[PDB]
């Protein structure tokens, strides 16, 4: 919820469908309460097509949110000690090619649902590229 936050991304790249591949985020400088916790996952987004939400976790009590294209496939994970978080995605499908973007929102109470809109994530990383080939 800090101003000098940085999300730093790991893996990525390509494969053919039905493979798997991994992706990593660390939201380092992140401060905020103990009274409250937040939110971080994946957005992803195909040439030409608008982003879409991926999966997101929240900290602390591990809510997980996965959009209905990915369920079965993908799983979202968090390691409280090393403050990363992680997405394994299996059997990857030419529709799940695109860049990959980390994001993490404002805290707030553990009583709010982990939230998935894009409208609703205030710290970006840069982007990582998944493509499935044929
Ligand atoms: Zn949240």
């Known amino acids: 919820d800090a101003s000098q936050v940085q999300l730093e991304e790991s893996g990525g790249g390509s494969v053919q469908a039905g493979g798997s591949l991994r992706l990593s985020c660390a939201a380092s400088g992140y401060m905020y309460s103990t009274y409250s916790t937040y939110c971080m996952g994946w957005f992803r987004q195909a040439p030409g097509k608008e982003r879409e939400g991926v999966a997101f976790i929240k900290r602390g009590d591990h809510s997980t949110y996965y959009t209905d294209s990915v369920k079965g496939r993908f799983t979202i994970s968090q390691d409280s000690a090393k403050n990363t978080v992680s997405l394994q995605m299996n059997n990857l499908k030419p529709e799940d090619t695109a860049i990959y973007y980390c994001?993490?929102?404002?805290?707030?109470?553990?009583?709010?649902?982990?939230?998935?809109?894009?409208?609703?994530?205030?710290?970006w990383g840069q982007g990582t590229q998944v493509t499935v080939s044929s």
């Open positions: 994001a993490a929102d404002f805290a707030h109470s553990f009583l709010l649902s982990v939230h998935s809109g894009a409208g609703q994530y205030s710290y």
